[PDB]
Amino acid sequence: KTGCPEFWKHPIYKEFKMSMPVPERRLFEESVKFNAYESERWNTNLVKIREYTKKDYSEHISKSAKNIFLASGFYKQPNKNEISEGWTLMVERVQDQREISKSLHDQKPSIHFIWGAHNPGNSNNATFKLILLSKSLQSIKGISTYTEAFKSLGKMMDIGDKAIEYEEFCMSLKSKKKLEPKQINNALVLWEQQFMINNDLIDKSEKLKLFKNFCGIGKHKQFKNKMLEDLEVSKPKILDFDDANMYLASLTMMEQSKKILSKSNGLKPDNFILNEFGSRIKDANKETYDNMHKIFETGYWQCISDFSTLMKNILSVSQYNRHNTFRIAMCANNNVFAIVFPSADIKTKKATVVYSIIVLHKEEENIFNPGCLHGTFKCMNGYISISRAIRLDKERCQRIVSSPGLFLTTCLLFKHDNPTLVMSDIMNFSIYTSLSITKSVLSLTEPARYMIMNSLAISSNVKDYIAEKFSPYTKTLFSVYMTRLIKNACFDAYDQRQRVQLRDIYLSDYDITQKGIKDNRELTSIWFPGSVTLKEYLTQIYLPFYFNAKGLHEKHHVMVDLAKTILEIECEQRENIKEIWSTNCTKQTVNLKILIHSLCKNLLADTSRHNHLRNRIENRNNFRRSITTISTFTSSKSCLKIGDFRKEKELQKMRLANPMFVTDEQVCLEVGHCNYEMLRNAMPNYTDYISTKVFDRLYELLDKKVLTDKPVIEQIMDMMIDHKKFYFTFFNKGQKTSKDREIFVGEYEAKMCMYAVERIAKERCKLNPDEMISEPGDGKLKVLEQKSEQEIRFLVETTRQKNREIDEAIEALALGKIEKLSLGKAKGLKMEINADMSKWSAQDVFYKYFWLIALDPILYPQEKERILYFMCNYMDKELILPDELLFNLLDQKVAYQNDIIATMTNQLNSNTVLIKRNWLQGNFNYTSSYVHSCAMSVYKEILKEAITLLDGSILVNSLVHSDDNQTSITIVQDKMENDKIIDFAMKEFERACLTFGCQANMKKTYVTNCIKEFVSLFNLYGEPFSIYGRFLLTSVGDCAYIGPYEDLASRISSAQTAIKHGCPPSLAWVSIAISHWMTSLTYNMLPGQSNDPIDYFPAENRKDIPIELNGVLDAPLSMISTVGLESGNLYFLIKLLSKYTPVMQKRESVVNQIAEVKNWKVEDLTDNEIFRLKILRYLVLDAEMDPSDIMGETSDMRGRSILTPRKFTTAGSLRKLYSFSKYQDRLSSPGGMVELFTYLLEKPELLVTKGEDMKDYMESVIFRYNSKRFKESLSIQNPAQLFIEQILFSHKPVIDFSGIRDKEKEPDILGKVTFTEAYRLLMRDLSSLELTNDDIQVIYSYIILNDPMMITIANTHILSIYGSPQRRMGMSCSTMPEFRNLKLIHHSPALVLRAYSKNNPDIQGADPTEMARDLVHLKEFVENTNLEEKMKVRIAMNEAEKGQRDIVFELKEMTRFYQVCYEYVKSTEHKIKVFILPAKSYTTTDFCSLMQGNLIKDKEWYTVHYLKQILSGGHKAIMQHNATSEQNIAFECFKLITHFADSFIDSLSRSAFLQLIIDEFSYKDVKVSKLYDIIKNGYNRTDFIPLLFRTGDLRQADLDKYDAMKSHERVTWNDWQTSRHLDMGSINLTITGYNRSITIIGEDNKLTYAELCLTRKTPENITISGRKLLGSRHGLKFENMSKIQTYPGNYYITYRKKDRHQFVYQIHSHESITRRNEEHMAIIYNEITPVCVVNVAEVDGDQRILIRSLDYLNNDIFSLSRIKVGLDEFATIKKAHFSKMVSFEGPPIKTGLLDLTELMKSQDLLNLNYDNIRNSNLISFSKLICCEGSDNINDGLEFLSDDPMNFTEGEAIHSTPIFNIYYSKRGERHMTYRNAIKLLIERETKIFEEAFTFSENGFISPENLGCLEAVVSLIKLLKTNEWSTVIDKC
RNA sequence: AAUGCUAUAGUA
RNA sequence: ACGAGUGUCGUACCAAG
RNA sequence: CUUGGUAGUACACUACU
Ligand SMILES: *O[C@H]1[C@@H](O)[C@H](n2cnc3c(=O)[nH]c(N)nc32)O[C@@H]1COP(=O)(O)OP(=O)(O)OP(=O)(O)OC[C@H]1O[C@@H](n2c[n+](C)c3c(=O)[nH]c(N)nc32)[C@H](O)[C@@H]1O
Ligand SMILES: [Mg+2]
Ligand SMILES: [Zn+2]
């Protein structure tokens, strides 16, 4: 109701006003106070300002466009010289910044491990290996620094000959601190392979030098005795990458590694991956299986597996190391050992592990040495070599542990489908990259993407990027090798750009069959020798960025780096940036007039698009609803609190360690690390802050009554003026890039205001086509493809139009004439700009958002005032430096020279820095996107004006994201060379970006002819493309470590996403197998391990155990990609159907097969199936095993996992929360919890929700603290600690198994059962439950029939017939055709149960009369599953046995009810996003067919034929059925049947066929006769006049309306045009009106003549008749540049030009045309071009249709969809696509040998191209053959049509991307369907006869007859597999 | 081909 | 030694002789 | 240096999809 008058007095607003010119100030002040309603019109203020600024906008546009002539095509083109100069500058800069070392002894280990081949002779017993190690160590020869220490250690761990004593002592210790060592001869044993130091066997000097220098244990000065000294200032030291000697050494090291590791192990390769998924991998691809087996046979795999296993052992043995005890770790290899030197307990804070590898090799030079060796020593038998000491943390140890999966994935990705790549090189590169855990390779993997991409681009500034940004960090030799590889790739990229060639594009005006880049291995590989395709080249470029490990950054240094960056930007802005508005494109300035004009135009368009925008914003963002309902306001994310939190931080004397802050007393005190107390006391102006969860902060605000129960938008508005100071902290994202980014965190107050403003911006941004932030996920990939397709079109027809007459003259010519005519023609140009913006938020002008807010017409003046006040306050926000950063800074003792942090903090006087110009990253995404889209619109306008100056053609599409820009530009012109156009476009892109306060990152921006690069997505030439390998790498890489099932679920979801992006089937199976193997390793579940569940369940192998119970996945790959994580149960049920169902019903529909599940006997079921069905029924449907103690869990926290291990619980984090104290004190109350429990029992709505009101939300959040799942969710848990806990404590109880329904020094993650006794408990409880036929009926009824999607997928697996292979030429994106017909529940499961709890379907946020259907479905589930009756019985029996009601038990039961209801409703929700398929689907049948075809064989994709109506939506068809629904269904049915009848059937037999269809067929599960009755009774009978004539002869009423609706001008098309946009078909057109009728006859680009049968001959009626006739929706563009020579007299059609391409068509005389054109010749020249000639005659107005006449006129023709309604007028039926023809159902139609029902069911033979059928395969034609005793094939083909068909024609498009287009033409007489079938039969039968001969004599030879008899018998005996039928048929 | 107001692991 | 770094860090901590 | 005691995650992790 009230504004904020204090806004006009804000200093920020005053500066903004003074910066502006005087009239603009008045305009802004008027716009702020302008209101929509009280004004006469809503679009009056925007119009005023737009008119005011139009002059300046137009002058700027014209001046920018005029630069086209001043552009000389010397654009920034990369070449060899640019790369060389940039490399020299980079070398100089790197030398200046970092110290360069030329000595090889300065290298860091490339891989922190050394390996040698195993010894077959020596056994694998631990004691024998230990004795051998001791003897080898004691036998070292020679002299060195540490040889004495190593000999002494060998003496210490030597056990002599008392092997039996050692074994029995170790067993005794393992049978069960201050462990006492027994003197085993010379050893001092405390445990298995652990030895205490022996001062008697070693010199003290040797021990000190080993533990101080070699290992670094205690070598430092403890940071207290290190005062003002030993602090060495030095630059980072790296090797010389460009040095010839260093590169030679690196190459030698790589060669040695290749030489040794290539040798085979010499053993049979067997492992989990093989034994589980080998068959599936081999079926998907044999080459992938061969490559994987060869990998398993090599020494690389054994090396990496040994390293992983040894590291897993090292981490396990490091828990209880003493100060003077060193342990020994072993592995599978009997020659590789590690010594774990004493260190801290590794599960503590930032604890590291110290180890040194020992390798025993018979010969020297037999040791894989990746720069980690310390020395090889000769000893007894062979040599012994020991590596340098290695210290690593937990995250690096994790990566090293999860190495083999990454190695295998990388090797299989690089090698896949490439025979010219040597596998050893790939495996060498992969083993060196995957084992990298250092920043060196991480500093090269990311920049290489940009370097090679900009080198390959048409134009780029790669020289600058190399000179300034590229900075290799070469501390290892492999880093030098990779740097040389990158340099060579950058050199080669330019030379091989021309080696990319486009594929032959196929056009149909509705779809593009073929597109993309040609598949020729011409490009040179990057990381290793060989040749690669463009897709493989891009994969090699982009994949290595995902090799990087996450969390390799160290907090001590990265926090300082981020603070330095932010403060440097801030100080540069403070000291150099003063002006705001600039017209010279100054940096960090905005042009005012242009910005205002563009904003006004875009706002006008957006508001004009939708009338109701304010409401759209209010409703979609819960503006009118309470704050508790909004999700982001109730999340568990972090939030900032500013106040007095001294006590909390203090809970967790010494000197401050900083000379500046030391007082007199502080001098005489010990130095110590800064904590909160010393920081607070010393630092005068320190603001105190803490971080608490968002929901906890909201609860605290509700307690203090800051926020009430008023609608959120009202609450946000009052706080915009109630909050005046903003504080923001920051932390490090921990990303995997070279430089980590900073993440800004703000308080709850700022959060809500930013939420409101950005929702306002977002709802407007969703109304524009440019911004891609609005779409979710891979929706962008679909858009990119659509834009590419439309540009490709526009280019094709524009180039054809501009050069059609030139090409015609060239054809008529056929040397010198060809040259000049080719010179004088338009040139097609396609340019793609892949642009990024540098420092999108840091160096961004924030004053344009003021104008954006002020010009918004959907806001009241008070709202504008409050939002502007909020923005002004935001400009005064202060960044709070984190306490850890202050601790680092205050612990220096040496003053940094250019200390920017101290400079900006008043010498660390305060921890707040006033950040003004920088709006923090991630806060203003949508406003920035809108402004960037406005800038792109300005750029588009400039480009259009410039192209108009050249009189060319333009098409600009600018994809917009937050800071990622994709601008694609298509130009057709003939005035100047293309290079000048490219230079002009790039310069104006710079100018347009600068005019709006942005700047394009040319240092990372590049331009290509074909490649589209939007955000992480590719579109080569309209073919969607993506690097799917990143999903596999991420799945194999970072893990949550939360639990065995959810880990596997995340891995399988990543595999599913990769499949969606085009992963070949074999690599997906490899990824799934690797995921299962890694999950088994993490929890010790391999065959024979501790937690192997195969012996605890009635299952033959792991394939028969559900994933939830730690089984392996068994499902078809196409089925997994469709749903995922429910495929196991679905496949199990499908297998049960395939087995038990009777033979009669097996190839029936899945519903029909389920219909006889009652006939099944429950007794004759195997144990495994009974167990799995009990699992399904009870656990999935009516949960009886609680996965945890479900005490405070809402109806949201149930997954599918049954055995969920407990996780960490952090006492400190909970004690931080303000609501946790309330929960504890309420729990401390004598009976407080019971009152809350019974209050919830009285209000069960709070279980599903979290409390719509204030008080109920308070109670719900208090109650949720009892769950111990929500408690452990708020806890701090890191993958590293969880991984080390899993690998350390495997026997600890971690699982809480309460059972069916219900029934000191404790660790943090203690549980109830030990993960193994849980199997026994689960099986025991399952034995109690019983199974009946009703239970099975419920399981099939719900998991399958409830969802149409499940019925459909099971239908796909039952009715599938695999067909002919064919190449993957053009890929396309199709999401899910007719989704709504497959969705059971409309709304989200949260809303459905929300409307179920409150017994009212009218809940806010949902749709009434749609909640009705959903609640009906839900209620149905509860009723048929007895979900309520069983709960009531249980409650009654519990109360009876107890004798009094139990609130807790009732709460548990009710929570379980809502929880299983939520799980059931969520199970019916499927989120299937965009897919990449070898074609684009038209129906669900086509989509499923494409999926199955693409997801079987990697090399080729097949075509599948669902035998019996796969969709089978019997219940769904009843749902969503309406009057118009049936009427639309009938229209499509009859269009399809008529067009099929006259397109494929012989004309003389078309009537009987139509009658047979209309009598005994059905469409969409609807009888056809009913549809015909609908057609006859419908009003629009005229649309099917030919059909009504051919059948039933219904007339006189349709005909009268047909000659009657000519009241408005009606247009008919006597013959359809073969190409509508390319202008290439026979055209016959007729337009009829009042006493007027014109008929147009022409072919392709030439119009022959036009007959005008006008009523009167006067030359005045002719013009009015012409304009009236040609002004109708004829659809003939009249763009036929076939201008006709003019003859005196007569009349010509001509088309004048009207702007916006609204050409006006008129009829004119010769003399009039000539006179007007000569008059207009006087000094844009618009000339009327006469096209076609007009014949004028006088005719009467008599009616032209009589029912009797039709039979005579139509006697000659026999066409069902077309009849001659007049002599030259044809009545026609609208066409429809033939993809819908599958929905037809009926008995086979027997036309001799041919069966027409299977023909019309066939999709490959329904094509209208003679060539596509003449060149088909027998397999496609086989399904048609139905012999019935026939021998002659010709008898059958007589029924096929003999009308001429289309044949493809090839043309060359003249454009800078050279490509050829292939389209259809009319053809000839001999090109008929029957001729094509005859040729196909002859060719394919000959080929089949020669293919299956395998006999000396021939095909019909008796021996071959017997062989074919054996083949058909094999099938007549073996069960019908996927491909048996086609062999028999052919 | 399509057309109903609520259409509801990743990116910087 | 190793990790990190053109920011001083980690390189276990405390008590006693 | 020698003999004893201690240590569960760098207690931190956002804004939009
Ligand atoms: O499913 C769509 C379309 O994809 C599919 N289809 C097109 N071509 C097909 C084919 O060759 N074989 C099969 N099996 N399916 C084919 O059928 C549906 C489109 O049918 P169609 O009837 O061709 O679509 P129209 O746009 O022509 O529909 P209509 O409502 O008649 O459009 C009127 C609108 O377009 C002008 N018009 C009509 N016709 C026939 C032409 C023409 O031949 N050339 C030009 N230049 N314009 C035409 C009407 O005058 C008006 O402007
Ligand atoms: Mg980009
Ligand atoms: Zn036969």
Swiss-Prot record:
GO cellular component, one term: virion component
Molecular function GO labels: hydrolase activity; metal ion binding; nucleotide binding; RNA binding; RNA-directed RNA polymerase activity
UniProt cross-references to CDD domains, sorted A to Z: PDDEXK_RNA_polymerase-like
Subcellular location: Host Golgi apparatus; Host endoplasmic reticulum; Host endoplasmic reticulum-Golgi intermediate compartment; Virion
Location of the RdRp catalytic domain: 818-1006
Domain of life: Viruses
InterPro entries reported in the protein's UniProt record: CapSnatch_bunyavir (IPR048006), L_protein_N (IPR029124), L_thumb_ring_bunyavir (IPR048547), RNA-dir_pol_NSvirus (IPR007099), RNA-dir_pol_orthobunyavirus (IPR014384), RNA_pol_bunyavir (IPR007322)
Residues involved in Zn(2+) binding: 1827
Residues that hold Mg(2+) according to the record: 964
Region feature (Cap-binding): 1607-1740
Catalysis performed (reactions): RNA(n) + a ribonucleoside 5'-triphosphate = RNA(n+1) + diphosphate
GO BP terms, alphabetized: DNA-templated transcription; viral RNA genome replication
Pfam families named in the record: Bunya_RdRp (PF04196), L_protein_N (PF15518), L_thumb_ring_vir (PF21561)
Entry's cofactor comment: For endonuclease activity. Binds 2 Mn(2+) ions in the active site. The divalent metal ions are crucial for catalytic activity.
Assigned keywords, A-Z: Host endoplasmic reticulum, Host Golgi apparatus, Hydrolase, Magnesium, Manganese, Metal-binding, Multifunctional enzyme, Nucleotide-binding, Nucleotidyltransferase, RNA-directed RNA polymerase, Transferase, Viral RNA replication, Virion, Zinc
Signal peptide span: none
Catalytic activity, EC: 2.7.7.48, 3.1.-.-
Cofactor(s) recorded in Swiss-Prot or TrEMBL: Mn(2+); Mg(2+)
Family membership: Belongs to the Bunyavirales RNA polymerase family.
Remarks, miscellaneous: Classified as His(+) endonuclease since it has a histidine upstream of the active site that coordinates the first cation.
UniProt function note: RNA-dependent RNA polymerase, which is responsible for the replication and transcription of the viral RNA genome using antigenomic RNA as an intermediate. During transcription, synthesizes subgenomic RNAs and assures their capping by a cap-snatching mechanism, which involves the endonuclease activity cleaving the host capped pre-mRNAs. These short capped RNAs are then used as primers for viral transcription. The 3'-end of subgenomic mRNAs molecules are not polyadenylated. During replication, the polymerase binds the 5' and 3' vRNA extremities at distinct sites.
NCBIfam families: capSnatchArena (TIGR04202)
Assembly with partners or alone: Homomultimer. Interacts with the glycoprotein N; this interaction allows efficient polymerase packaging into virus particles. Interacts with nucleoprotein N.
Protein name from the UniProt record: RNA-directed RNA polymerase L
Name of the gene encoding the protein in the UniProt record: L
